Design a protein around this ligand. Structure first.
Ligand SMILES: *[C@H](O)[C@H](C[C@@H]1CCNC1=O)NC(=O)[C@H](CC(C)C)NC(=O)OC[C@@H]1CCC(=O)N1C[C@H]1C[C@@H]2C=C[C@H]1C2
Ligand SMILES: *[C@H](O)[C@H](C[C@@H]1CCNC1=O)NC(=O)[C@H](CC(C)C)NC(=O)OC[C@@H]1CCC(=O)N1C[C@H]1C[C@@H]2C=C[C@H]1C2
Lengths: 305, 305
C-alpha cells in the first residue's frame, strides 16, 4: 500500500455554515457566513423554466420575503432575509443575524490540477464529504444528486477556510461543475438546463509527477532511468499528447530533494509510460494517476504541510 | 472599407477616482481605493534586492500600519492614514480611516481567456493611459506596462457597476504581462517573484476569430463563406491539433449568425481552410486570422447593440 488515500479536510467548521434556502417552489443549499447567505441563483427559477431563465427579471420579481432560510443542524434557526442581490450565478442574501459559527475564511478560485474538499448537502443537511481535483476542462468528477446544488467546496490554510466552489450542475458525461464565489462559473459553462459543449480533459502532468514520486518514496522506482526530458521539451510534447504543460512548484522540488530523482527524469518516464506500462504496475496501477497533488504526497507520506 | 472596429475601452473616469499611490520603504506602486480598503500588490513590501524569493509572510508580520504611505494625487488630493493591513494571496488589503467618497458600484470577478477588459495604466498613483486587452488562453495579456505600473487595474462595466478583474503584477520574458484577480490569485500558474517562470503556450481564440469573420461579413467581405460546414465537435478536435481554443458558442455569437444569416459551422469550416493560408487574399485588410475582437465588440461596434 502506497499510504495514499483520498483525504478531505475535517468538515465540522463548514457544516456549521450550511443552510436550506427556499424560494417559492424550489429549494437548495446555502452557505451562511457573517450576515450573508450564498446560494445558486437558479433557486429563483420555476422548474418549468430552467432551460431559458431570465435571471435579471426573476431577481426584480423577488422581495426579501420571497426567500426562506433555515438552519437545521446544531442550534436550528430561521433567518430573516433583509436584502437580496445577484452576483454572477450566485445569490447574495443578507440576513439579520450573523452566523456565530463563522470561521476565518476567504474566497479563492481553484486551478486545474488542484485538489479541494466538498461537503455534499441536501435540504441544508450535510450528508458526505469527498475530495476532487479540478480537471483541466473545469469539471470535477464528483458525486452529486438532485438537491445537492449549493454544496460547497473548499481548501484550508491553517485555520482559514478558502471557499472555492458552489455546486450547480451535472454534465452529460457525468462530471460536475459550479461557481466560484465571485459568481463566475468554472470553465465556459452556463447555469441553464441545456446540454452544453464540454471541453476536452487532459492528464495533469504535475500530478502525475507527484504520483511517480510517491511511488519512489514507497521504494517503487523501476521506471526511473538516467534519461531526462527538459521541461520545455516535455511541454512541447504535452501539447501533442493531451497532457497539461508542466509548471514546477516548491512542493514538487521538495519531492525531488527527498528522493534524489530529478523532475526531468520523471518527465522522461511519463513519455515512456504513456506508450504503455509493458505489463508492469506502479503502485498497483497499470495507468497514469493524476488525482494526487504534490501537496498530497508531501503531507500524506512525508508529513510536510 | 474600414471595418468600423477599434480597440474600445470603457471611459476611465470612475476608476481614475479610485487610484492611489502606495509606498512602503523605498518601494512605490499603485493601489485601488474602494470604501475603506486599498488593494495593492504585496511585493510593495519587498526590498529590491529580495524580489527573487520573498518571504511574504515574514514581511507582512514585520510591517506596521505606519509602514505604508497612501496618497491620492488627482482630483481632491489626500494623504490617507492606514489603520489596518492584511494579505490576501498576492495582494495587500490596507484599511484606511476614510471611505473613498468616489467609490463606484463595483464587484470583483475573474476574467476568462478570450474576454476583453479595460486597463487603466498608472504610475505613482497617477493615471496615464487606458487601453483594452483580451485575456490570452495562457493567462497573459499583451499590455503596455513599464516600471512602476504595478497595481494598475483592469475592469469591465455592466451598467453602472464596475467589475474589477485584474491588478497588474509582472512582465514575462516574451513581453506579455500578467497579474492578480482580487481574490489574490495570480492568473495562470504564475507566481509574484522575480524568477524565470514557465510560460504556457498561447493559442488562437476561436470564438473571437469567429466574431471577426462575422465582422467581415457584416462589412460585405464574405468571399471565404462556403456552403461547407464543420460541426462544433469536429472543429474542437481540430482545434486541439492546431493551437486553437475549443469553440463554445454564446448568445452574442448567435446574434451575429442571425444578423448575417451565416451559420457558426460555416465559419468553423472557413477557419480551418484560412488557417492554412489566405491564398493571397485579405480579410478586413489582414492576411492572418484576428482574435483580439470579441463577439460583444462586433455586436456593439458594428450592429450597435
Ligand atoms: C442542483 O441540485 C442540480 C444538481 C444536479 C442534479 C443531478 N446531479 C447534479 O449535480 N442542478 C441541476 O439540476 C441543474 C440546474 C441548472 C444549472 C439550472 N441542471 C442540470 O444539472 O442539468 C443536467 C442536464 C443538462 C441538460 C438537462 O436536461 N439535464 C438534466 C438531465 C437529467 C434527466 C436526464 C437527462 C436530462 C433530464
Ligand atoms: C511592477 O511595477 C512591475 C511591472 C513590470 C516592470 C516592467 N514591466 C512590468 O510589467 N513588476 C515587476 O517588476 C515584477 C516584480 C515581481 C513580481 C516581484 N517583476 C517583473 O515584472 O519582472 C520582469 C522582468 C524584466 C523582463 C523580464 O523578462 N522579467 C522577468 C525575469 C525573470 C527571469 C529572469 C530574468 C527575467 C526572466
Amino acid at each position: 500500500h502506497s499510504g495514499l488515500v483520498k483525504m478531505s479536510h475535517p468538515s465540522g467548521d463548514v457544516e456549521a455554515c450550511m443552510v436550506q434556502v427556499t424560494c417559492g417552489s424550489m429549494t437548495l443549499n446555502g452557505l451562511w457566513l457573517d450576515n450573508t447567505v450564498w446560494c445558486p441563483r437558479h433557486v429563483m427559477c420555476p422548474a418549468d423554466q430552467l432551460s431559458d431563465p431570465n435571471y435579471d427579471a426573476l431577481l426584480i420579481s423577488m422581495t426579501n420575503h420571497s426567500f426562506s432560510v433555515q438552519k437545521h443542524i446544531g442550534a436550528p434557526a430561521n433567518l430573516r432575509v433583509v436584502g437580496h442581490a445577484m452576483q454572477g450565478t450566485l445569490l447574495k442574501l443578507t440576513v439579520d443575524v450573523a452566523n456565530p459559527s463563522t470561521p476565518a475564511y476567504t474566497f479563492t478560485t481553484v486551478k486545474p490540477g488542484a485538489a479541494f474538499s466538498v461537503l455534499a448537502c441536501y435540504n441544508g443537511r450535510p450528508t458526505g464529504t469527498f475530495t476532487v481535483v479540478m480537471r483541466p476542462n473545469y469539471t470535477i468528477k464528483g458525486s452529486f444528486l438532485c438537491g445537492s446544488c449549493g454544496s460547497v467546496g473548499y481548501t484550508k490554510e491553517g485555520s482559514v477556510i478558502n471557499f472555492c466552489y458552489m455546486h450547480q450542475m451535472e454534465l452529460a458525461n457525468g462530471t460536475h461543475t459550479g461557481s466560484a464565489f465571485d459568481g463566475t462559473m468554472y470553465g465556459a459553462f452556463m447555469d441553464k438546463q441545456v446540454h452544453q459543449v464540454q471541453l476536452t480533459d487532459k492528464y495533469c502532468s504535475v500530478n502525475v509527477v507527484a504520483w511517480l514520486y510517491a511511488a519512489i518514496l514507497n521504494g517503487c522506482a523501476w521506471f526511473v532511468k538516467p534519461n531526462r526530458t527538459s521541461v520545455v521539451s516535455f511541454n512541447e510534447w504535452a501539447l501533442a499528447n493531451q497532457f497539461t504543460e508542466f509548471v514546477g512548484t516548491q512542493s514538487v522540488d521538495m519531492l525531488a530533494v527527498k528522493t534524489g530523482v530529478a523532475i526531468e527524469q520523471l518527465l522522461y518516464a511519463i513519455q515512456q509510460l504513456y506508450t504503455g506500462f509493458q505489463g508492469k504496475q506502479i503502485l498497483g496501477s497499470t495507468m497514469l494517476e493524476d488525482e494526487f497533488t504534490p501537496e498530497d504526497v508531501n503531507m500524506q507520506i512525508m508529513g510536510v504541510v
